[PDB]
Structures are given as C-alpha cells and as structure tokens.
Amino acid sequence: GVMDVNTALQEVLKTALIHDGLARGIREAAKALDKRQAHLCVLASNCDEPMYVKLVEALCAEHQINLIKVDDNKKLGEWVGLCKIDREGKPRKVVGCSCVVVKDYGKESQAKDVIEEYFKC
Amino acid sequence: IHRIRITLTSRNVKSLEKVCADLIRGAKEKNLKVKGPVRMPTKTLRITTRKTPCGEGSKTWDRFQMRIHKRLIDLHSPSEIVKQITSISIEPGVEVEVTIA
Amino acid sequence: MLMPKKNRIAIYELLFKEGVMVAKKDVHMPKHPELADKNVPNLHVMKAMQSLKSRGYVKEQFAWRHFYWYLTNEGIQYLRDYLHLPPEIVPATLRRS
C-alpha cells in the first residue's frame, strides 16, 4: 500500500466510473469544467491527435484548472472493472472526469487526501 | 361531566349476554346511577349474489344476512370503577367504543 | 428498463435503508402513491422490477395486482454488491432480534 497518487488514481477512476462520471470524449465533460465542478482532472497523455487534448485544455483554461497526468492510462481503464451488463462483454474506458468537489460525497477514502495533496503542490 | 356513553356491537347474542353479565357484575360491586342497557333493534342488511357467471342454469341468488346487534350504556359514575370493570381483557369479537359528547 | 439511473440508485438506496418495498402496477396513475410529488413514470420502474426478477436475483412473484419483494441472504448480498453499499450497513428490519 504505497501512499501516492499514481496507485490511488485507479480508485479515483473507479469512483468516477461507478458514481456518475463517464465523461468519455467530449460528451459529459463540459459539465464539470464550465460549472467549475471539477477543480482537479485527469487527462490522457501520449496522444497522436492534438484536437481532443487541446479542446480539453481550452475548456480547463476557461477557468484555469489544473489536471493530473499519468502514463499507461489504458491499464487504469482495464483495472476499473467495467465489465457490467451482468457479465456481458469486456469494454474499456477512454477518459473520465472527477466531478463535484475534489472527491465525491460517498465513502471517505485516502484517495481524496492524496489528490488534495497533489492539487496543493 | 356525567355524560359518558359506551356502544358495544357484535353479531352474536351470547356474547352480548356475557357482556351484560359483566356490566351487572360491576353494578353489583357498587350501586350507581347507571341506567339499564339500551337494546338497539337487530339491524339487518341483505346481500344477494348470482353464482352462474355466464347465464347457464337457475337464478340462485345466494341470500346472505349481515345482522349486527348493538347495545348501549350511558353511565354517571367515577371513571376508575367503570374502567376497571370494562378494561378486564374483554372478549374478542365484540367491539366496544367509549364516547363523550 | 428505460428509467434514468438516478431514480434507480435512489430506489435501491431507499430499499436497503428500509428493507423490502411495495409495488402497485398500473399505467393510469399520474404520480406514485408512496413516491408522490415526484412524477416518476411507472412503466420504467415496472420494467426494472421484471428485469431484476428475470435476471435471477429476487424470486419472481406475481401476486394479484400487488407486488412485494423477496429478501434473502443472497438477495441482500447482491443488492449490496450492485449498489456498492458500505461494509457497515445493516437493515433496520433485523433490529434487536
């Protein structure tokens, strides 16, 4: 149990998955950024297309909100546990947004504190 | 105030008779200006039911009776005595209501 | 099954906070009897009920225009997993044995 943002981003994305979120692509992403709902975001890196990343950055700079950058972002979406539909299919999640406050209103977790530390410094 | 009424109602005769026995026993315990039971008329309702859903056979209207029987007692008595007399784990099946008008 | 999921999670949360729940089946109602002053479409919740009873997690029962749930250890455990409820909640129906 290493207390760092890199390992707890799996839990933060599990929360963004189960508790609303699912702001894949452009859809469902502007709600958190134009309303200042998300004061800490996670952005896909190593992208061949500057279009989506630059539009996300423009939306963030509309209020100048910082973002979390990690590598191997597809393994995160593999580990979120997105099987669902009882046990039908094995889909994957491309991106998600952490909405309303740094962490949701559900279970209090260590991930909220580690991402507070990451946003602070 | 000395205006308290009790209404008991049931479809059985012997139940009302044992309730009146309870009341006369209470009156035997102490003599009070409690009037006699008021025997309401045996109030009958008729219900009539056809049985053959589709018309096939006789018009045998099941004739059922609902005959409710009512007894009243108006009492001018201390509350404790009649409360002890009445609240004695009354018989099931007879419905008693206390009214203050 | 076409009810927006917020009502689904709300119904599941109130279900586990209360235990079992009742169901009246009719399309002509304007607003739910117990869930009044909310304007919830009944057809969607009915489809959700028949789906969860067809999915094989609460014993399906058709009882004469008025439906109830069938709570068991497996059903409670599955509801806990499906709603991701915290590992501290116990239903109020089992109070004081």
Added chain:
Amino acid sequence: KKRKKKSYTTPKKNKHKRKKVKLAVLKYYKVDENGKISRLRRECPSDECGAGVFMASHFDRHYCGKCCLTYCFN
C-alpha cells in the same frame, strides 16, 4: 382475425440515424482572433437546462422544450 401481412405499409421502423464526429467540432466554434476559445453565442439566462447544452442560432422556430423565446435575424 388473420395476420395482416404487415409488409405492404411500414413493415418495421429503424432507429434514428445521425452522422457525428468522434470528437465534437460542430458544437464548439473557432475563429475569433483569440488564442483560446471565444464564446460568440450569447448566453441564455435560463439555467434550468444542463451545463453541456450548447446554445444554437436557428433560422426558424425554437427547439428547447421549456422556455422557447422568440427572436429573428432580420
């Protein structure tokens, strides 16, 4: 009754078909001589809708659902 042979008129309808780009280009508009995104569309004071709803300029009629003001270009 017998089966109507429901192929002479409307055998069955299919789901709505639309052409959409994987990353939206029509909802956001560029070209306003700014290094960042510029919102040329005037914001509506009605906040009862969603945050992701983009206000559009239509030539005829209104499709909002709750307020539907009246205006034109002239």
Added chain:
Amino acid sequence: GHQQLYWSHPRKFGQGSRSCRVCSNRHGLIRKYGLNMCRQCFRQYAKDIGFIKLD
C-alpha cells in the same frame, strides 16, 4: 407540446384501474362498503367475517 406528446387522456370514471384490488380482475365489483373482492371470494370469506344464511 409536452401535454399532447404523452398523456392527453384521463379517465375519471375508471373502474378497470380502480377495480377489485385483492385479485386481478375488474368484474365482480360492487362499490358499497368497500368490497374489492369477487363474489367467489366474497362467499369464500363470508362465514369467516360472520356471515350466516337464513333466507
């Protein structure tokens, strides 16, 4: 608008929806006394309440 798209039609004389509740049918309902039970179950639970026949 929305009032014609869906639910533009009430029924204020509804007996089918407000039928005998305890079983799943509309017929066999009389609105006195709050019966909400068919005649077959009316008889099946008659003597239980206290019903007797003398006519």
